[PDB]
Design a binder for this molecule. Sequence first.
Ligand SMILES: [Mg+2]
Ligand SMILES: [Mg+2]
Ligand SMILES: [Mg+2]
Ligand SMILES: [Mg+2]
Ligand SMILES: [Mg+2]
Ligand SMILES: [Mg+2]
Ligand SMILES: [Mg+2]
Ligand SMILES: [Mg+2]
Ligand SMILES: [Mg+2]
Ligand SMILES: [Mg+2]
Ligand SMILES: [Mg+2]
Ligand SMILES: [Mg+2]
Ligand SMILES: [Mg+2]
Ligand SMILES: [Mg+2]
Ligand SMILES: [Mg+2]
Ligand SMILES: [Mg+2]
Ligand SMILES: [Mg+2]
Ligand SMILES: [Mg+2]
Ligand SMILES: [Mg+2]
Ligand SMILES: [Mg+2]
Ligand SMILES: [Mg+2]
Ligand SMILES: [Mg+2]
Ligand SMILES: [Mg+2]
Ligand SMILES: [Mg+2]
Ligand SMILES: [Mg+2]
Ligand SMILES: [Mg+2]
Ligand SMILES: [Mg+2]
Ligand SMILES: [Mg+2]
Ligand SMILES: [Mg+2]
Ligand SMILES: [Mg+2]
Ligand SMILES: [Mg+2]
Ligand SMILES: [Mg+2]
Ligand SMILES: [Mg+2]
Ligand SMILES: [Mg+2]
Ligand SMILES: [Mg+2]
Ligand SMILES: [Mg+2]
Ligand SMILES: [Mg+2]
Ligand SMILES: [Mg+2]
Ligand SMILES: [Mg+2]
Ligand SMILES: [Mg+2]
Ligand SMILES: [Mg+2]
Ligand SMILES: [Mg+2]
Ligand SMILES: [Mg+2]
Ligand SMILES: [Mg+2]
Ligand SMILES: [Mg+2]
Ligand SMILES: [Mg+2]
Ligand SMILES: [Mg+2]
Ligand SMILES: [Mg+2]
Ligand SMILES: [Mg+2]
Ligand SMILES: [Mg+2]
Ligand SMILES: [Mg+2]
Ligand SMILES: [Mg+2]
Ligand SMILES: [Mg+2]
Ligand SMILES: [Mg+2]
Ligand SMILES: [Mg+2]
Ligand SMILES: [Mg+2]
Ligand SMILES: [Mg+2]
Ligand SMILES: [Mg+2]
Ligand SMILES: [Mg+2]
Ligand SMILES: [Mg+2]
Ligand SMILES: [Mg+2]
Ligand SMILES: [Mg+2]
Ligand SMILES: [Mg+2]
Ligand SMILES: [Mg+2]
Ligand SMILES: [Mg+2]
Ligand SMILES: [Mg+2]
Ligand SMILES: [Mg+2]
Ligand SMILES: [Mg+2]
Ligand SMILES: [Mg+2]
Ligand SMILES: [Mg+2]
Ligand SMILES: [Mg+2]
Ligand SMILES: [Mg+2]
Ligand SMILES: [Mg+2]
Ligand SMILES: [Mg+2]
Ligand SMILES: [Mg+2]
Ligand SMILES: [Mg+2]
Lengths: 209, 14, 56, 120, 122, 114
Amino acid sequence: MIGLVGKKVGMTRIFTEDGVSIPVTVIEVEANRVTQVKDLANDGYRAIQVTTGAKKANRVTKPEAGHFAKAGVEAGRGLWEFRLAEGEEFTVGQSISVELFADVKKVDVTGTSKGKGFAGTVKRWNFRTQDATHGNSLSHRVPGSIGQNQTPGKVFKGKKMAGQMGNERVTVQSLDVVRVDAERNLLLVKGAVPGATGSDLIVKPAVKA
Amino acid sequence: PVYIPRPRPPHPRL
Amino acid sequence: AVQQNKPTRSKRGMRRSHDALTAVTSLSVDKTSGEKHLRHHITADGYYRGRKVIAK
Amino acid sequence: MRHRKSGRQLNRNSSHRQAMFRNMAGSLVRHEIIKTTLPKAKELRRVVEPLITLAKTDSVANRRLAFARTRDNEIVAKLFNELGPRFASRAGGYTRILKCGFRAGDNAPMAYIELVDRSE
Amino acid sequence: MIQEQTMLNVADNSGARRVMCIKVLGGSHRRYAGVGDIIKITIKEAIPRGKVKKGDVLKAVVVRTKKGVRRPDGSVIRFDGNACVLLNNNSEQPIGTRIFGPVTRELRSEKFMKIISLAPEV
Amino acid sequence: SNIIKQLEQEQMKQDVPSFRPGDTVEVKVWVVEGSKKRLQAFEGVVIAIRNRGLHSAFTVRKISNGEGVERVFQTHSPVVDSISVKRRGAVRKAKLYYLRERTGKAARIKERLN
RNA sequence: AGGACCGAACCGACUAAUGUCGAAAAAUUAGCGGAUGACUUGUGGCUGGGGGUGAAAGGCCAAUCAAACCGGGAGAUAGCU
RNA sequence: ACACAGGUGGUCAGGUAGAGAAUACCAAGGCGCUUGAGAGAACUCGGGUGAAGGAACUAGGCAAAAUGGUGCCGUAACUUC
RNA sequence: AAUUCCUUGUCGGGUAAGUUCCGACCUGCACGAAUGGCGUAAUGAUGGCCAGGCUGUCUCCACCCGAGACUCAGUGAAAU
RNA sequence: CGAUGUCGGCUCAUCACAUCCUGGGGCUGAAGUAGGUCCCAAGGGUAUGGCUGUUCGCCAUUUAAAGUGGUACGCGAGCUGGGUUUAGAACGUCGUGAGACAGUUCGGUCCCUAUCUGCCGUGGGCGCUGGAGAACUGAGGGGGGCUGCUCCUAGUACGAGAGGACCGGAGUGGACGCAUCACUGGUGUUCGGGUUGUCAUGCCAAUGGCACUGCCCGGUAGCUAAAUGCGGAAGAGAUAAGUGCUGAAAGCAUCUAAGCACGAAACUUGCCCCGAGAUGAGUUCUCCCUGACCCUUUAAGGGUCCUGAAGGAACGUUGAAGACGACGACGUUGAUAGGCCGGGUGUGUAAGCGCAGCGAUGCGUUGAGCUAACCGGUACUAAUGAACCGUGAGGCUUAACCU
Ligand SMILES: [Mg+2]
Ligand SMILES: [Mg+2]
Ligand SMILES: [Mg+2]
Ligand SMILES: [Mg+2]
Ligand SMILES: [Mg+2]
Ligand SMILES: [Mg+2]
Ligand SMILES: [Mg+2]
Ligand SMILES: [Mg+2]
Ligand SMILES: [Mg+2]
Ligand SMILES: [Mg+2]
Ligand SMILES: [Mg+2]
Ligand SMILES: [Mg+2]
Ligand SMILES: [Mg+2]
Ligand SMILES: [Mg+2]
Ligand SMILES: [Mg+2]
Ligand SMILES: [Mg+2]
Ligand SMILES: [Mg+2]
Ligand SMILES: [Mg+2]
Ligand SMILES: [Mg+2]
Ligand SMILES: [Mg+2]
Ligand SMILES: [Mg+2]
Ligand SMILES: [Mg+2]
Ligand SMILES: [Mg+2]
Ligand SMILES: [Mg+2]
Ligand SMILES: [Mg+2]
Ligand SMILES: [Mg+2]
Ligand SMILES: [Mg+2]
Ligand SMILES: [Mg+2]
Ligand SMILES: [Mg+2]
Ligand SMILES: [Mg+2]
Ligand SMILES: [Mg+2]
Ligand SMILES: [Mg+2]
Ligand SMILES: [Mg+2]
Ligand SMILES: [Mg+2]
Ligand SMILES: [Mg+2]
Ligand SMILES: [Mg+2]
Ligand SMILES: [Mg+2]
Ligand SMILES: [Mg+2]
Ligand SMILES: [Mg+2]
Ligand SMILES: [Mg+2]
Ligand SMILES: [Mg+2]
Ligand SMILES: [Mg+2]
Ligand SMILES: [Mg+2]
Ligand SMILES: [Mg+2]
Ligand SMILES: [Mg+2]
Ligand SMILES: [Mg+2]
Ligand SMILES: [Mg+2]
Ligand SMILES: [Mg+2]
Ligand SMILES: [Mg+2]
Ligand SMILES: [Mg+2]
Ligand SMILES: [Mg+2]
Ligand SMILES: [Mg+2]
Ligand SMILES: [Mg+2]
Ligand SMILES: [Mg+2]
Ligand SMILES: [Mg+2]
Ligand SMILES: [Mg+2]
Ligand SMILES: [Mg+2]
Ligand SMILES: [Mg+2]
Ligand SMILES: [Mg+2]
Ligand SMILES: [Mg+2]
Ligand SMILES: [Mg+2]
Ligand SMILES: [Mg+2]
Ligand SMILES: [Mg+2]
Ligand SMILES: [Mg+2]
Ligand SMILES: [Mg+2]
Ligand SMILES: [Mg+2]
Ligand SMILES: [Mg+2]
Ligand SMILES: [Mg+2]
Ligand SMILES: [Mg+2]
Ligand SMILES: [Mg+2]
Ligand SMILES: [Mg+2]
Ligand SMILES: [Mg+2]
Ligand SMILES: [Mg+2]
Ligand SMILES: [Mg+2]
Ligand SMILES: [Mg+2]
Ligand SMILES: [Mg+2]
């Protein structure tokens, strides 16, 4: 089915009576309000656009404000989109709560991983460090060779070099839903999800069974 | 100039 | 380490196509003294947002 | 990679930074307004405003803390004698930064930092 | 975290005193041996009339590590040294008849029941 | 976070007694040999305490049959059934890691009797 | 007492790193050797080019050494480029 | 060749600790080394710390780590004693 | 063997595993007696090998402190 | 030959397939297990040590396996320098000798600030035909794809016994990857404490500087691995080798000629990420601007005045964003940062005072004091009115509909 848009509310653990400790990420999933329903006749595919949270009526622009007023919902902190799965139908202005996940066992969570900035090859690609001693000249964390010789005469595309690490769209799949608490608007999922505290997460039912 | 340094020895292609 | 051919005036100017300075888009007029100044900077006489703050 | 970290290094080591901010705190308490660089002023807020918060309560242990942190008895007296009573009702924010152009010799962003009572 | 060249104390009375891990068994490129793990050892130090000889190559099961085991609740059990029980090289079947120092529940399996029974603790 | 504090309060146990590093403490924890649920005692000196609300832990250092053992217990973990202070110690450090390189007579803490 | 020992100055230069369009045409930093002697150092002097001097490496003889440098024979000669 | 991390003989040489002209902190005295201001990526340099392991590194324990003082006890083979 | 080609000779020791090392053998390609032979205490910034300790040398890197690198202002090269 | 750096190692690879493992199959002198041989198959994977400068090889112990080759037997403007290749020295040997040795032995400077191509990242410009804010589609591209063991089936099939399955399930690992910091830890020169030497604050007391953070002991946040969650798939399509069904040519036979099936980690998908400069520049939603004159070759023309929207940019406070740009959040109608308040955390019973003691010191006040980056609040300070850019209804042709 479709997913929800939550916010990463940090991590903690659930102690169970049988003794186990479960590391859970806490995702506050407020009501996702449908701002637009896309269909084959007009858009060519079936999806719902949702919003969540709240913005200020000075940071919401006139185009955004009109797009929200057409739906009848109040402005949220952005818009997301979920493809419909042939069996569900949503109306503009409908609220979807975390109760959508009441029966879900595993979810995929998509976040924007924490940004590491410009990373070297050791950190970014698990490149092996060269010698610390034994004669090494200024070449301890340097990448080593990047190509062969005259015969290729070039570096191949997709060479693992240094560059921007993190700050990108990551999906962690098949995380156990530990708890769905509808009154608190909370989803407790086992393990870590991408991103920092307070970042948007997209939680949808697991695509691999 | 007046002083030209000796060039560095080549790689010993021997 | 070093070039095999000298670059051209064309390549030189194309590289310098990003070296152009940006002028300050606008200057601020002081509430009280009416002097020009940078946003969020005191004026040359020591006013900021209409009040004498330095008296230099 | 600097996530959630505070404190400007200011291209100094820790001992030099500590001594420089001790001196600058003394100078700001003495003159009630000083012209420095903008990053130095922003970093000096976190040095001088705790000193005034300390000086709000006048005990011997507080005098000795202020001395351990400023190393100037004239400064420790101006705090606890003038600035503490002056800012007794301020809930923080005893300093004000005013950006003032750029330095001639190196084009450094300049800022005045003053105490918000200096209206005389 | 036992790897090759790690020296372990001997937790049984098979005669060995210090052994060296020469191979972490099970899996290519496998790096470490935790508690319930079988390693290949050589005997670096033994007692004169023991059941094993110095320089013997055989197997051993780790029973205590300084690194320790973590429990499902997050708890940790660490020890002040790495110890192992020597096993016959073909069938594991501990060589000694006594076992010194405590062990952990991680050793409660079908093949180390002898060890879990002979141990003086846990 | 208020949300996480609310989720952790509802799990924190209230029976947790007061103890300090240096105190000799018996921790009774739950052991499972399959069907039966037994209670096992671990008595030793508290060498470290980590106060983090629900994530609080404490390291107890025992000297078992020969080998010395340390056990980091999670305080609010349901496997820890009970914590009792058998003896109060009079150290003046928060962490007693120097007790690791001490044995016998050099490893004994004077009693607090405060 | 000692071409004794440990160790500063001092005299060296074993290792490593840096530097290698250097701070430096030989260094710096950390260690290292000798450190009352066949020691080290100042000032002055003497030995000179097939000559000197050399606890000897063809080492050194003014950042030049299997024959210094300067000037001359000299526009040597160059079946080579 | 430089306002150059080099070289350059002699004399004077205080305090506390110290065996000391070592070393640390100071005195007298003299300086902050003639680009600064920010930021706080990779990587390089110079350092600090490090779970478990402990030479598995490597040509080689290179480098690093380690040892380190005084007094007393005690000290093997071998020896030219 | 600073000498031995075959050759990593053989046997012994040391290692789980030793082309190195140490001991011995002698089949010395091609030792040998002042161009000295053999030994040798002490000595050596000497060559080789082993052990204890010690460790970021390594498994396998992590973090931190500074100087650069990066941005701004000023000055302003070089090989090619 | 007016120089194309030469072994091995390291680092990083990349391709082939003559395939080492895993996958599929035929034959077997294939009972099972386990093999042999051949065919298909390159998706992924494909040891650590001792010796030696080694490539190689020997050995030890693993592994599902420890593939074979190409790539200047890849890779020194990436590293090393043990070997080979200078100058010293010695041995054996050769030579009268100087010297020589695919003989050995000890020692012996490894430069380059990247212009271009390439590659990894990240921006600016313009375009995309009125402008703008969003959300998408998805051409196309990349990533990923490994595998052990145990148990059930079942001690069943098979087998005289020994031994011992296929097929199909379940669990738990190794290596690899992604994320994260709840836990366990590392770090934590920005927190607290102990302590040595010395100097200073007049002195005592208390503090501060310096001594590598002087040396240490702990330790917040952040970052992080050794910590912890997750992943490789299932499925689908089309196939390889192979196996067929029906079936003539060729009355039979025949997998093939017509036709119809099955068939593998290979291929296309499915999973994840990028992605409309996809100039073939796409779609959807929303928002904004509907004022006049002059001139000329009355041109998709130029000029003047008035008008400046949506939005943006700039500036400021900044960020779990970041080299810089960029990106995100705020700018008084405000929690953006600092301060402050409360808490937490860490350290660990401050100072002063009093008491005991000859004193060092202990005790009480007191789990005190202090406490970074944390949490929750709070306009005290700083985020200024403005100004700036961006316009004024958007070409032609044709077609389809209301006039
Ligand atoms: Mg970041
Ligand atoms: Mg170098
Ligand atoms: Mg280096
Ligand atoms: Mg430029
Ligand atoms: Mg911050
Ligand atoms: Mg200091
Ligand atoms: Mg309590
Ligand atoms: Mg002497
Ligand atoms: Mg000297
Ligand atoms: Mg000399
Ligand atoms: Mg040397
Ligand atoms: Mg000597
Ligand atoms: Mg000496
Ligand atoms: Mg003289
Ligand atoms: Mg010679
Ligand atoms: Mg000379
Ligand atoms: Mg001549
Ligand atoms: Mg001449
Ligand atoms: Mg002539
Ligand atoms: Mg001529
Ligand atoms: Mg100068
Ligand atoms: Mg000078
Ligand atoms: Mg002295
Ligand atoms: Mg001195
Ligand atoms: Mg740095
Ligand atoms: Mg260190
Ligand atoms: Mg370590
Ligand atoms: Mg520690
Ligand atoms: Mg350790
Ligand atoms: Mg050890
Ligand atoms: Mg080795
Ligand atoms: Mg190796
Ligand atoms: Mg090496
Ligand atoms: Mg060394
Ligand atoms: Mg050292
Ligand atoms: Mg010979
Ligand atoms: Mg021999
Ligand atoms: Mg001879
Ligand atoms: Mg003779
Ligand atoms: Mg000598
Ligand atoms: Mg060895
Ligand atoms: Mg630069
Ligand atoms: Mg500049
Ligand atoms: Mg040539
Ligand atoms: Mg040429
Ligand atoms: Mg093939
Ligand atoms: Mg393949
Ligand atoms: Mg392919
Ligand atoms: Mg595939
Ligand atoms: Mg070797
Ligand atoms: Mg061989
Ligand atoms: Mg070549
Ligand atoms: Mg090659
Ligand atoms: Mg190259
Ligand atoms: Mg090479
Ligand atoms: Mg190089
Ligand atoms: Mg060499
Ligand atoms: Mg020679
Ligand atoms: Mg694909
Ligand atoms: Mg691919
Ligand atoms: Mg945390
Ligand atoms: Mg810690
Ligand atoms: Mg620390
Ligand atoms: Mg931490
Ligand atoms: Mg004084
Ligand atoms: Mg005092
Ligand atoms: Mg001083
Ligand atoms: Mg000093
Ligand atoms: Mg499939
Ligand atoms: Mg604030
Ligand atoms: Mg007290
Ligand atoms: Mg007190
Ligand atoms: Mg006191
Ligand atoms: Mg406290
Ligand atoms: Mg507080
Ligand atoms: Mg106000």
